[PDB]
From a paper:
The structure contains one monomer in the asymmetric unit; the other monomer of the dimer shown in the figures is a symmetry mate. We also reprocessed to higher resolution and re-refined the previously described, cleaved porcine pro-TGF-β1 structure. Despite the increase in resolution from 3.05 to 2.9 Å, the overall quality of the re-refined model and its Rfree greatly improved. The porcine, PC-cleaved structure has four crystallographically distinct monomers in the asymmetric unit but nonetheless has pseudosymmetry that resembles the symmetry of the human R249A mutant. Four unique monomers are present in re-refined, cleaved, porcine pro-TGF-β1; because chains A and C and B and D are similar to one another, we only show chains C and D in the figures. Residues 252–258 in the mature GF are α-helical, in contrast to the much more extended conformation in the uncleaved GF. The conformations differ among the N termini of the crystallographically distinct GF monomers in cleaved WT pro-TGF-β1. Nonetheless, the structural environments of the N-terminal residues of the cleaved GFs are similar overall in having close interactions with other GF residues, and none extend into the solvent-filled channel in the middle of the pro-TGF-β1 ring.
However, the GF remains strongly noncovalently bound to the prodomain, which keeps it latent during storage in extracellular milieus. The structure of the pro-TGF-β1 dimer reveals that the prodomain dimer surrounds the GF dimer. TGF-β cannot bind its receptors and signal until it is released from the prodomain (i.e. activated).
Residue numbers in the entry:
A (entry chain A): 2 to 63, 70 to 207, 217 to 239, 250 to 361
B (entry chain B): 1 to 62, 71 to 208, 216 to 239, 253 to 298, 312 to 361
The structure:
């Protein structure tokens, strides 16, 4: 291990140097930004709090994201004391969260830059299981179902998240000043012999730590490859290549009755470092979505999206239908 | 010259073909192709083709191992008997119950089961509908599983519901009968002693062929960072590397954090092709699978910026 540990350190240094170009290329910077103007001392109150929640454990829901970094912003809902109580007065099992659309356009000027928008809630009900549903205020009159969530009991207050990216993108398109969501308890009912059975504050609503929208978008200053593009175009870079395999013609096998063949495509092509490649084009950028130059020390043209293959074959007199995983290559990536 | 590029591709294509020869055999865990002298000539039986079709059928629904899974299916109890007299005249509810012994014959032991799907032939062509799936936990109760918003489609469509955990629990249970419930979505809200309630021909095909069934994928009976940091492995795996922006990169511009666990993948990916060449590609590499982002805080002049960079932290590695 005397002459192997030192070899390991060279790999670690190779990884570190790739990360140097890795971070700078993501930020679309040739060199680290100038610091002469920066105030010394601790970070501001809003900056630390913004960075805090990005690391915090949140509740998940259950096109692919790009290589370059996303600017994260957040907008807290309109304050509790004003406006949000008179229109929905005394609703026992419904929580309303409305946002100023101009505050969203201040963070994200145009919708095309927005890549993800999350609605955040500070859940408090520790001991009992609850089933909730999320709704979007499309118009002033009706609400539309978005999603639901079965919430198991948790001993500690937990931050809940709802992916409302598609909804917030439509909000950035609209000029209407106020938009919002509605979180209500799950309704369970059933009709039977002309009878009908029906079964049905949770979170911080005021000040800081009230519900908010977390926006991840490409900043304005900075404003994989599936078979549907790899089969049409001839590319020098890493991509999917067609290969139909006949169990008779190519493998000399007769025991697979169904199918007689399938498209087992392969990945083939050079994977240069993303910063070593020409200025970014939409067709070349896709490959690099999971790009981590130092991870494997040498990036390879490997598959991303794969599909299974069901087959039919015999064991004696007995026919068997089986499914094989990861047989069909649908996309390739450099990583 | 394209004459000497055709030849290069043919060599790559043959390497892929030869790896696939080993891939298929290794997934089925066979050393050589099985003997076919006893196989009946002619078309496959009625049930065998139908079972195979549904594996290919295009369906809309909302890690798995390397080796192949045996696919079986079990149709629900027929309409005319037993399943209507206890649920007589339910206007907005469709009931699907299954014999638990038929499931244990298809999947002998619950540990072997890897996936179970409930299949429905949707019929409502023109109208958008919202449905919910329920499980018969007890003799008195049903339990919420999932829901589905169904957009209009001109053609009858096969719907799928992932009921793996439910069907696996059925094999754990000893009760002879189990089943599901598909009902219309209930939307209500109470306000000042008032209450608004909204709901939403047969919804799906219910009798004869193409009736609801469970599609079972299980390992045959005959085939019977938290891991990378503890053990030292020669093969491809995750390797520890903490990176301090000052100590390792010489940087002062990233105020938060001062560093992070950016692990790397390292190890050769040159009978047991599960960790050797899972993808069967011409040259397998040790590349990461699970990646995690890294939020940072830095300054550009006077304006502080908090940004998130994707795929910075390697959590798992694979041979591909
Ligand atoms: C499972 O999938 C295959 C996918 O093709 C299905 O194959 C089709 O089976 C039908 C069965 O009737 C064939 O229809 C035939 O039509 C000709 C006239 O065109 C008639 O002479 C035959 O008597 C038969 O009725 C159809 O051609 C065949 N598909 C292809 C591409 O040939 C199969 O039906 C599926 N499911 C089953 C068998 O339940």
């Amino acid at each position: 291990s005397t002459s192997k540990t030192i070899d390991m350190e060279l790999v670690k240094r190779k990884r570190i140097e790739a990360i140097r170009g890795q971070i700078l290329s993501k930020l679309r910077l040739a060199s680290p930004p100038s610091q002469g103007d920066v105030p010394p001392g601790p970070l501001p109150e809003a900056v630390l709090a913004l960075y805090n929640s990005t690391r915090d454990r949140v509740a998940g829901e259950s096109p692919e994201a790009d290589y370059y970094a996303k600017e994260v912003t957040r907008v807290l809902m309109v304050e509790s004391g004003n406006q949000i109580y008179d229109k929905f007065k005394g609703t026992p099992h419904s929580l309303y969260m409305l946002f100023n659309t101009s505050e969203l356009r201040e963070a994200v000027p145009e919708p095309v830059l927005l890549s993800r928008a999350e609605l955040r809630l500070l859940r408090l009900k520790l001991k009992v299981e609850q089933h909730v549903e999320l709704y979007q205020k499309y118009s002033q009159d009706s609400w539309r179902y978005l999603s639901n969530r079965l919430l198991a009991p948790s001993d500690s207050p937990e931050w809940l998240s709802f992916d409302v990216t598609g909804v917030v993108r439509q909000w950035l398109t609209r000029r209407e000043a106020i938009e919002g969501f509605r979180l209500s308890a799950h309704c369970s009912c059933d009709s039977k012999d002309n009878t009908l059975h029906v079964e049905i504050d949770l979170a911080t609503i005021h000040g800081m730590n009230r519900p908010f929208l977390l926006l991840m978008a490409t900043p304005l200053e900075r404003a994989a490859l599936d078979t549907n593009y790899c089969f049409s175009s001839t590319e020098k870079n890493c991509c999917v290549r067609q290969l139909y395999i006949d169990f008779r013609k190519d493998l000399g096998w007769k025991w697979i009755h169904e199918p007689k063949g399938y498209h087992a495509n392969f990945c083939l092509g050079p994977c240069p470092y993303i910063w070593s490649l020409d200025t970014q084009y939409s067709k070349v950028l896709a490959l690099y979505n999971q790009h981590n130059p130092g991870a494997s020390a040498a990036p390879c043209c490997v598959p991303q999206a794969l599909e299974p293959l069901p087959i039919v074959y015999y064991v004696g007199r007995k026919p068997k239908v089986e499914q094989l995983s990861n047989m069909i290559v649908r996309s390739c990536k450099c990583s």
